[PDB]
């Protein structure tokens, strides 16, 4: 046999530059997996700025239903083994080329799954990596699966289509913004079976992408079209954020609870009326302006810093003045 | 006329190598703050391996109630201002040496606060930093506050304990030593002296420990678990959290709630199945799952079994809002 | 009256998402510069995973002659100013499309400059970034300058080539693709067209390459080595450095001198001894030593033999001013 | 046998929390080594903030004569092996307790070796780590060896003495500064056989450390005493730097060439007289002020930035105007 750890290796599923991907099965539980074998020698001869060494030590063991799981990593003197979730689905966009567009309900279900993984990635990844639809798969059960968990898509080998406006240009971007735009063309591809901007050659293609105007099939209700317009904003400052999509009526319909974490937000019952009023007075602003910061966790805003100074230095203690610790702290 | 952002700077409260620390007050709200002024010139001339630069950019704005708050940082061409919570109380270990030991009621309260900040630090500090009891202050309101959130005990310008592993200079993770460190603090509150150090440096090493007349057997078991010489046997944060003496009058806001405990864990099938195929006990498998030990072949097997279930949503996917661990 | 540090800002030269780029001139010396203004507010509202923040703090002040220089960075409460070298020439690939291909003499010169900057980037850039030929400009003095030193092609607001490994979306180190990328640039200088792309996207993948009438067999061998489809067979920076066509009229200042080559390497004893105990050739062992491949069991064995020598200072310890590689 | 990779394990030299250190020998070349075996299970149960995982991935393979070499790291599913240089010397400060002080020549030789390693560490280490004299060993040939290369000293198990002023206090420091101070008490220990500040109990001990005044035995020539005073400056801004020590006459005597790298510095022949004069005129300064920046690589100084702007924008090109690329770039 070919055996590493608790896993017995099998047929070769594909070959990369740095090694092959063999099918495997846990010797005890019998579950099937996909094991990527990276050869230390091949890596050493290639990775001279330490990029790959780096990408590998940035991996985490991802448990999310819609991202390919990295169950664990096993090391040997000459090799490194990555035991992953086995997914035989092929690309999602390949399914769309074959089957055509899907119905609203299957589009929404899948879209909610994909967006669930993207959000999870934003939270837990050492370094950001752009969402690529080629890396979106669908397993035997018709479930979305993100192929790239921080090392390249090992699953698939062998485009003429999408790029975000900031990306087509030489412009600097954060990447959740472009993930939204990317997630926009995916959602569109699901409902329509086409890309929102597919023009024939390169000059006219990336031209309309900057225009932002896209065709709207008749069977698209104005609710999903409003969402699609917001996600596809050419101006990243005007573009929808994950929270925007999360609060959109079209998206929220039949949304499974387990998908997104229950993030504690700011509640009206926390509000300190005296402090709110003091700030609005000492500044020029209105309550909406200050409340907006508290609800959106805009804590570095001079209004929020002031409000917090008043809360923390109250002599009498309140039940709702303590939302501080449950939260993570932000960075500068 | 010394004003930065919304803050007017005052008397110099303390002077460091890279800049001084001035007291300030907010220009609109009257609140007092403590502003650390870091000089780009002094720093540039001194940290040549980039330690200080790194440490500064690893800072986050800590808003925990028992850790000194960093409200905001303001940048100028020649300086970097750190607007922090102003706490004018002295070191806690200083208060215990002058006025005597405290009572069970006040010791527990203070200890719970301190451990709350320590846990918070373990969670969100980028690089670990040993908890030093000298960095624990006590304000006018008698609330514990940890001074070092990742630069320095910024506030202020004496036998020394260190964990066994630290004294012998061996390799350690540091939450382990933080537990040990918090052990001598807890002891100090109840006693007013340190559990081992009566001495100068040589004999302090090898130095159980003395147990004053009224110490209920409940708190002695806790202190005993925290002060274990063997780190593999030493108490963990979760152990203290579940200890009876600790659970008494424990403020709600102190710790976050994500322990995965019964119904959300219970897989009767995988529980025993792993315990069968691997020859081990339930306790061992349970232990890996509660911790970030998912890389343990027991946890990996368990998860393989869980993720391949037919229909179970409650246990299988509902737990996946927390974070992944690393290899 | 827009002045930052010693610099007076001018007409807006370009506007980005996070701030604009204004031209400036030094207040004392008349020199012109290009100042990127980054807005803390825009950034804070957009990079929520900290990518931009990270990228900014990974910046170093690059003074290489063929890479856009970052002279200094100035910080204000609301903004971050980047004082850079002002280069008003257009993209190099733009110059080649309008006015025709260049001659061997000028192509070699430009190519040597470009590779010099690329090598510099490989050495001192914290995170690797693929060399994009669109980011290569050409100044009024006809000297190549790479625009992206680690933030963005900051200067300016068209078929696209990508290395085989990049197009298929597979894992890569990136100096490999930089060689490939520099290959199509070198080809562009001599030809005035791209080596494969005649097309739109599908056929560009699988797409040796055409060889115009007078191309001496010396430059065709180089281009052939750089444009290898298999990265394991592809030319490395050191290969190009040692190539005959490249070595011609090569400016002194371009590359640093630390190749360890003959007398400083020669260990006749370890050379063969490793080659004996391991069954392999001299070429293989030599290859690991020249590179940072010291982790190869051949190099480890060789070093074990070297460090345990009796008296040899010249080869043994004299080589240890460079840097260690990592595991 | 007990064999990992090309190495055959042997007698246990000591036991750590996370594993033992066994003697080993290369199966082919026969050279003896010390192999630290770190157990993945022990690490996982302890390292929960990821400190140790981190320290290990920060390791580099150090080739320096006076720092313990990490020849390579070998990985297995349950273990990690670190193959290091075998050094049987015991602590340097232990040798001093036994033998007493050394002569100037053996002190200088050893001091030059130690300082050579410290400088190397400053250059190549991901994260700074304070120099501890307990971690300074001397091999069978009387050669200084730094035990901690970025993971704890594995070599030795089982103090009442030194700490730098910034360290005794709660003060923030860079650490090459305190390394100098640390290296100061080591040099002193070598010549004297005692520590410069050894007072009896803790109150009086750290008190004199802040005073900086120390006893000076008669057999100490004023040249080494000047060096010792500079290294032991209580004010870190006044304290000697590696370059200061490097240029000191006492240190430079009989200094082996291989010890320190030949760093290119700034030479008089590079000087641009017109540019130097322009700067001094447009500013208030003198040539010394500007030259000092160029010689000390103080390039972020407004004088240096100005000087460089003039050099880089000269129309005619010079041979000596190009010192730029041979250098590494600095950080902000």
CSV table of C-alpha atoms in Angstrom, one decimal, chain A:
chain,number,residue,atom,x,y,z
A,1,UNK,CA,0.0,0.0,0.0
A,2,UNK,CA,0.8,3.7,-0.1
A,3,UNK,CA,0.1,4.9,3.4
A,4,UNK,CA,0.7,8.2,5.2
A,5,UNK,CA,-0.5,8.6,8.8
A,6,UNK,CA,-4.0,7.2,9.0
A,7,UNK,CA,-4.6,7.6,5.3
A,8,UNK,CA,-4.1,5.1,2.5
A,9,UNK,CA,-3.3,6.7,-0.9
A,10,UNK,CA,-5.0,5.7,-4.1
A,11,UNK,CA,-5.5,6.7,-7.8
A,12,UNK,CA,-3.8,9.9,-9.0
A,13,UNK,CA,-6.5,12.6,-9.5
A,14,UNK,CA,-4.2,15.2,-11.1
A,15,UNK,CA,-0.6,16.5,-11.2
A,16,UNK,CA,0.7,19.9,-10.2
A,17,UNK,CA,4.1,21.5,-10.6
A,18,UNK,CA,5.0,20.6,-7.0
A,19,UNK,CA,3.3,17.2,-6.8
A,20,UNK,CA,0.2,15.1,-7.5
A,21,UNK,CA,-3.2,14.7,-5.8
A,22,UNK,CA,-4.1,11.1,-4.9
A,23,UNK,CA,-7.4,9.8,-3.6
A,24,UNK,CA,-7.1,8.5,-0.1
A,25,UNK,CA,-9.2,6.8,2.6
A,26,UNK,CA,-8.9,7.0,6.3
A,27,UNK,CA,-7.7,3.5,7.4
A,28,UNK,CA,-10.1,3.5,10.4
A,29,UNK,CA,-13.3,5.4,9.6
A,30,UNK,CA,-13.1,4.5,5.9
A,31,UNK,CA,-14.1,8.1,4.7
A,32,UNK,CA,-12.7,9.1,1.4
A,33,UNK,CA,-10.4,12.1,1.0
A,34,UNK,CA,-8.2,14.0,-1.5
A,35,UNK,CA,-4.6,14.2,-0.5
A,36,UNK,CA,-2.3,16.8,-2.0
A,37,UNK,CA,1.3,15.7,-1.9
A,38,UNK,CA,3.8,18.6,-2.1
A,39,UNK,CA,7.4,17.6,-2.7
A,40,UNK,CA,9.9,19.5,-0.6
A,41,UNK,CA,12.6,19.2,-3.2
A,42,UNK,CA,10.5,20.7,-6.0
A,43,UNK,CA,9.5,23.6,-3.7
A,44,UNK,CA,13.0,24.3,-2.6
A,45,UNK,CA,14.3,24.6,-6.2
A,46,UNK,CA,11.5,27.0,-7.1
A,47,UNK,CA,10.5,29.0,-4.1
A,48,UNK,CA,13.4,31.4,-3.6
A,49,UNK,CA,11.6,34.5,-2.2
A,50,UNK,CA,9.8,32.1,0.2
A,51,UNK,CA,6.3,32.8,-1.2
A,52,UNK,CA,5.1,29.2,-1.1
A,53,UNK,CA,6.7,28.4,2.3
A,54,UNK,CA,4.8,31.4,3.4
A,55,UNK,CA,1.4,30.4,1.9
A,56,UNK,CA,1.6,27.0,3.5
A,57,UNK,CA,2.3,28.3,7.0
A,58,UNK,CA,-0.6,30.6,6.6
A,59,UNK,CA,-3.0,27.7,6.2
A,60,UNK,CA,-5.6,27.1,8.9
A,61,UNK,CA,-7.8,24.0,9.3
A,62,UNK,CA,-11.0,25.3,7.8
A,63,UNK,CA,-14.3,23.9,9.0
A,64,UNK,CA,-17.0,25.5,6.9
A,65,UNK,CA,-19.6,23.6,4.9
A,66,UNK,CA,-19.1,25.6,1.7
A,67,UNK,CA,-15.3,25.8,1.7
A,68,UNK,CA,-13.2,22.7,1.0
A,69,UNK,CA,-12.0,21.5,4.4
A,70,UNK,CA,-8.4,21.1,5.3
A,71,UNK,CA,-8.7,18.2,7.7
A,72,UNK,CA,-5.0,18.2,8.6
A,73,UNK,CA,-1.4,18.5,7.3
A,74,UNK,CA,1.0,15.6,7.7
A,75,UNK,CA,4.8,16.0,7.4
A,76,UNK,CA,7.5,13.6,6.2
A,77,UNK,CA,11.2,14.3,5.6
A,78,UNK,CA,10.8,14.5,1.8
A,79,UNK,CA,7.1,15.4,1.5
A,80,UNK,CA,4.2,17.4,2.9
A,81,UNK,CA,0.7,15.9,2.8
A,82,UNK,CA,-2.5,17.9,2.8
A,83,UNK,CA,-5.6,15.9,3.7
A,84,UNK,CA,-8.6,17.7,2.3
A,85,UNK,CA,-12.3,17.2,1.8
A,86,UNK,CA,-13.1,15.1,-1.2
A,87,UNK,CA,-15.4,16.9,-3.6
A,88,UNK,CA,-16.3,15.5,-7.0
A,89,UNK,CA,-18.4,18.3,-8.6
A,90,UNK,CA,-16.5,20.1,-11.2
A,91,UNK,CA,-16.7,23.9,-11.6
A,92,UNK,CA,-20.0,25.8,-10.9
A,93,UNK,CA,-19.6,28.0,-14.0
A,94,UNK,CA,-19.1,24.8,-16.0
A,95,UNK,CA,-22.5,23.6,-14.8
A,96,UNK,CA,-24.0,26.8,-16.0
A,97,UNK,CA,-22.5,26.5,-19.4
A,98,UNK,CA,-24.1,23.0,-19.6
A,99,UNK,CA,-27.4,23.5,-17.8
A,100,UNK,CA,-28.0,27.2,-18.4
A,101,UNK,CA,-29.5,29.5,-15.9
A,102,UNK,CA,-31.1,28.3,-12.7
A,103,UNK,CA,-34.4,29.3,-11.0
A,104,UNK,CA,-34.5,32.0,-8.3
A,105,UNK,CA,-34.7,29.5,-5.5
A,106,UNK,CA,-31.7,27.4,-6.5
A,107,UNK,CA,-29.9,30.6,-7.3
A,108,UNK,CA,-30.6,32.1,-3.9
A,109,UNK,CA,-29.7,28.9,-2.1
A,110,UNK,CA,-26.4,28.6,-3.8
A,111,UNK,CA,-25.6,32.3,-3.6
A,112,UNK,CA,-26.3,32.3,0.2
A,113,UNK,CA,-23.9,29.3,0.4
A,114,UNK,CA,-21.1,31.0,-1.6
A,115,UNK,CA,-21.4,34.3,0.3
A,116,UNK,CA,-21.3,32.4,3.5
A,117,UNK,CA,-17.9,31.0,2.6
A,118,UNK,CA,-16.6,34.3,1.4
A,119,UNK,CA,-17.5,36.1,4.6
A,120,UNK,CA,-15.9,33.2,6.6
A,121,UNK,CA,-12.7,33.7,4.5
A,122,UNK,CA,-12.7,37.5,5.2
A,123,UNK,CA,-12.8,36.7,8.9
A,124,UNK,CA,-10.3,33.9,9.0
A,125,UNK,CA,-7.4,34.1,6.6
A,126,UNK,CA,-4.0,35.5,7.4
A,127,UNK,CA,-3.8,37.2,3.9
A,128,UNK,CA,-6.7,38.1,1.7
A,129,UNK,CA,-7.1,36.2,-1.6
A,130,UNK,CA,-9.5,37.3,-4.4
A,131,UNK,CA,-12.5,35.2,-4.9
A,132,UNK,CA,-12.3,33.5,-8.3
A,133,UNK,CA,-15.5,31.8,-9.7
A,134,UNK,CA,-13.3,29.1,-11.4
A,135,UNK,CA,-12.6,28.1,-7.8
A,136,UNK,CA,-16.2,27.7,-6.9
A,137,UNK,CA,-17.4,24.1,-7.1
A,138,UNK,CA,-20.6,22.2,-6.4
A,139,UNK,CA,-20.5,18.7,-4.7
A,140,UNK,CA,-22.6,15.7,-5.4
A,141,UNK,CA,-25.4,17.2,-3.3
A,142,UNK,CA,-25.5,20.5,-5.3
A,143,UNK,CA,-23.7,22.4,-2.5
A,144,UNK,CA,-21.3,25.3,-3.2
A,145,UNK,CA,-17.7,24.7,-2.3
A,146,UNK,CA,-14.8,27.2,-2.4
A,147,UNK,CA,-11.7,25.4,-3.9
A,148,UNK,CA,-9.0,27.8,-2.8
A,149,UNK,CA,-8.7,27.8,1.0
A,150,UNK,CA,-5.3,29.7,0.8
A,151,UNK,CA,-3.3,27.4,-1.4
A,152,UNK,CA,-4.1,27.1,-5.1
A,153,UNK,CA,-7.1,25.1,-6.3
A,154,UNK,CA,-5.6,21.6,-6.2
A,155,UNK,CA,-8.8,20.0,-7.4
A,156,UNK,CA,-8.9,21.3,-11.0
A,157,UNK,CA,-6.7,21.8,-14.0
A,158,UNK,CA,-7.8,23.6,-17.3
A,159,UNK,CA,-11.6,32.5,-18.3
A,160,UNK,CA,-12.5,34.9,-21.1
A,161,UNK,CA,-14.8,36.8,-18.8
A,162,UNK,CA,-14.9,38.9,-15.6
A,163,UNK,CA,-12.7,41.3,-13.7
A,164,UNK,CA,-13.6,44.1,-11.3
A,165,UNK,CA,-13.1,47.7,-12.3
A,166,UNK,CA,-10.4,48.3,-9.8
A,167,UNK,CA,-8.7,45.1,-11.0
A,168,UNK,CA,-8.9,45.8,-14.8
A,169,UNK,CA,-7.2,49.0,-13.9
A,170,UNK,CA,-3.9,49.3,-12.0
A,171,UNK,CA,-5.7,50.4,-8.9
A,172,UNK,CA,-5.1,49.5,-5.2
A,173,UNK,CA,-8.0,47.7,-3.5
A,174,UNK,CA,-8.9,46.0,-0.2
A,175,UNK,CA,-10.5,43.0,-1.8
A,176,UNK,CA,-13.7,42.4,0.0
A,177,UNK,CA,-15.0,45.1,-2.3
A,178,UNK,CA,-13.9,43.2,-5.4
A,179,UNK,CA,-15.1,40.0,-3.8
A,180,UNK,CA,-18.5,41.6,-3.7
A,181,UNK,CA,-18.2,42.6,-7.4
A,182,UNK,CA,-17.0,39.1,-8.1
A,183,UNK,CA,-19.9,37.6,-6.1
A,184,UNK,CA,-22.1,39.9,-8.2
A,185,UNK,CA,-21.2,38.3,-11.5
A,186,UNK,CA,-21.6,34.9,-10.0
A,187,UNK,CA,-25.1,35.7,-8.7
A,188,UNK,CA,-25.9,37.1,-12.1
A,189,UNK,CA,-24.5,34.0,-13.9
A,190,UNK,CA,-26.8,31.9,-11.7
A,191,UNK,CA,-30.0,33.8,-12.6
A,192,UNK,CA,-29.2,34.6,-16.2
A,193,UNK,CA,-26.7,32.0,-17.4
A,194,UNK,CA,-24.6,34.8,-18.8
A,195,UNK,CA,-22.2,37.3,-17.4
A,196,UNK,CA,-23.3,40.9,-16.9
A,197,UNK,CA,-20.4,42.2,-18.9
A,198,UNK,CA,-19.3,39.8,-21.7
A,199,UNK,CA,-18.5,42.1,-24.7
A,200,UNK,CA,-16.7,40.6,-27.7
A,201,UNK,CA,-13.1,41.8,-27.7
A,202,UNK,CA,-11.0,43.3,-24.9
A,203,UNK,CA,-11.4,47.0,-25.8
A,204,UNK,CA,-15.3,46.8,-25.6
A,205,UNK,CA,-15.3,44.3,-22.8
A,206,UNK,CA,-13.6,46.2,-20.0
A,207,UNK,CA,-15.2,49.3,-21.3
A,208,UNK,CA,-18.8,48.4,-20.3
A,209,UNK,CA,-17.5,47.1,-17.0
A,210,UNK,CA,-16.5,50.7,-16.2
A,211,UNK,CA,-20.0,51.8,-17.3
A,212,UNK,CA,-21.7,49.5,-14.9
A,213,UNK,CA,-24.9,49.3,-16.9
A,214,UNK,CA,-26.0,45.7,-17.6
A,215,UNK,CA,-28.8,43.8,-19.3
A,216,UNK,CA,-31.8,42.8,-17.1
A,217,UNK,CA,-33.8,39.9,-18.2
A,218,UNK,CA,-37.6,40.2,-17.7
A,219,UNK,CA,-37.9,37.2,-15.3
A,220,UNK,CA,-35.7,39.1,-12.9
A,221,UNK,CA,-37.8,40.7,-10.2
A,222,UNK,CA,-36.9,44.3,-9.3
A,223,UNK,CA,-35.9,43.2,-5.8
A,224,UNK,CA,-32.9,41.1,-7.0
A,225,UNK,CA,-32.1,43.7,-9.6
A,226,UNK,CA,-31.7,46.3,-6.9
A,227,UNK,CA,-29.2,43.9,-5.1
A,228,UNK,CA,-27.5,43.2,-8.4
A,229,UNK,CA,-27.1,47.0,-9.1
A,230,UNK,CA,-25.6,47.6,-5.7
A,231,UNK,CA,-23.1,44.8,-5.8
A,232,UNK,CA,-22.0,45.8,-9.3
A,233,UNK,CA,-21.3,49.5,-8.5
A,234,UNK,CA,-18.2,50.7,-10.4
A,235,UNK,CA,-17.4,53.0,-7.5
A,236,UNK,CA,-16.1,50.8,-4.7
A,237,UNK,CA,-17.2,53.5,-2.1
A,238,UNK,CA,-20.7,53.1,-3.4
A,239,UNK,CA,-20.6,49.3,-3.7
A,240,UNK,CA,-22.6,47.0,-1.5
A,241,UNK,CA,-20.8,45.4,1.5
A,242,UNK,CA,-21.5,42.0,3.0
A,243,UNK,CA,-23.7,43.7,5.6
A,244,UNK,CA,-25.7,45.4,2.8
A,245,UNK,CA,-26.3,42.0,1.1
A,246,UNK,CA,-27.1,40.4,4.5
A,247,UNK,CA,-29.8,42.9,5.2
A,248,UNK,CA,-31.3,42.8,1.7
A,249,UNK,CA,-34.9,41.3,1.5
A,250,UNK,CA,-34.2,39.2,-1.5
A,251,UNK,CA,-31.2,37.6,0.2
A,252,UNK,CA,-32.8,37.2,3.6
A,253,UNK,CA,-35.6,35.0,2.2
A,254,UNK,CA,-35.3,31.3,3.4
A,255,UNK,CA,-31.9,32.0,4.8
A,256,UNK,CA,-30.5,29.0,6.8
A,257,UNK,CA,-29.5,30.1,10.4
A,258,UNK,CA,-26.2,28.2,10.5
A,259,UNK,CA,-24.8,30.0,7.5
A,260,UNK,CA,-23.7,33.2,9.2
A,261,UNK,CA,-22.6,33.7,12.8
A,262,UNK,CA,-24.8,35.6,15.1
A,263,UNK,CA,-22.7,38.7,15.4
A,264,UNK,CA,-23.8,40.9,18.2
A,265,UNK,CA,-24.7,44.3,16.9
A,266,UNK,CA,-25.7,47.5,18.7
A,267,UNK,CA,-29.2,47.6,20.1
A,268,UNK,CA,-31.5,50.5,21.0
A,269,UNK,CA,-31.6,49.3,24.6
A,270,UNK,CA,-27.9,50.0,25.0
A,271,UNK,CA,-28.4,53.7,24.0
A,272,UNK,CA,-27.4,56.3,26.6
A,273,UNK,CA,-29.7,59.3,26.0
A,274,UNK,CA,-27.7,61.7,28.1
A,275,UNK,CA,-24.4,60.8,26.4
A,276,UNK,CA,-26.0,60.8,23.0
A,277,UNK,CA,-27.4,64.3,23.6
A,278,UNK,CA,-24.1,65.6,25.1
A,279,UNK,CA,-22.2,64.6,22.0
A,280,UNK,CA,-24.8,66.0,19.5
A,281,UNK,CA,-24.7,69.3,21.5
A,282,UNK,CA,-20.9,69.7,21.9
A,283,UNK,CA,-20.5,68.7,18.2
A,284,UNK,CA,-22.8,70.0,15.5
A,285,UNK,CA,-24.3,66.6,14.6
A,286,UNK,CA,-27.6,64.8,15.0
A,287,UNK,CA,-28.5,61.6,16.8
A,288,UNK,CA,-28.7,59.7,13.5
A,289,UNK,CA,-25.1,60.7,12.8
A,290,UNK,CA,-23.9,59.4,16.1
A,291,UNK,CA,-26.2,56.3,16.2
A,292,UNK,CA,-25.0,55.4,12.8
A,293,UNK,CA,-21.4,55.0,14.2
A,294,UNK,CA,-22.6,52.9,17.1
A,295,UNK,CA,-24.7,50.6,14.9
A,296,UNK,CA,-21.9,50.3,12.3
A,297,UNK,CA,-19.1,49.9,14.9
A,298,UNK,CA,-17.4,53.0,13.4
A,299,UNK,CA,-15.6,53.4,16.8
A,300,UNK,CA,-12.6,55.3,15.4
A,301,UNK,CA,-15.0,58.2,14.5
A,302,UNK,CA,-14.6,61.3,16.8
A,303,UNK,CA,-18.3,61.0,17.6
A,304,UNK,CA,-17.9,57.4,18.8
A,305,UNK,CA,-14.7,58.1,20.8
A,306,UNK,CA,-16.6,60.9,22.6
A,307,UNK,CA,-19.6,58.8,23.3
A,308,UNK,CA,-17.5,56.0,24.7
A,309,UNK,CA,-15.5,58.3,26.9
A,310,UNK,CA,-18.8,59.3,28.6
A,311,UNK,CA,-20.0,55.7,28.9
A,312,UNK,CA,-16.8,54.3,30.4
A,313,UNK,CA,-16.4,57.0,32.9
A,314,UNK,CA,-20.0,56.9,34.3
A,315,UNK,CA,-19.8,56.4,38.0
A,316,UNK,CA,-22.9,54.2,38.3
A,317,UNK,CA,-22.5,50.9,36.3
A,318,UNK,CA,-25.0,49.7,33.7
A,319,UNK,CA,-25.9,46.2,32.3
A,320,UNK,CA,-25.7,47.4,28.7
A,321,UNK,CA,-22.5,49.6,29.0
A,322,UNK,CA,-20.3,46.4,28.7
A,323,UNK,CA,-20.6,45.4,25.0
A,324,UNK,CA,-16.8,46.0,24.9
A,325,UNK,CA,-15.3,42.6,25.8
A,326,UNK,CA,-17.6,40.3,23.7
A,327,UNK,CA,-16.2,42.2,20.7
A,328,UNK,CA,-12.7,41.9,19.2
A,329,UNK,CA,-10.6,45.1,19.1
A,330,UNK,CA,-9.9,47.0,15.9
A,331,UNK,CA,-6.6,48.0,14.4
A,332,UNK,CA,-5.0,51.3,13.2
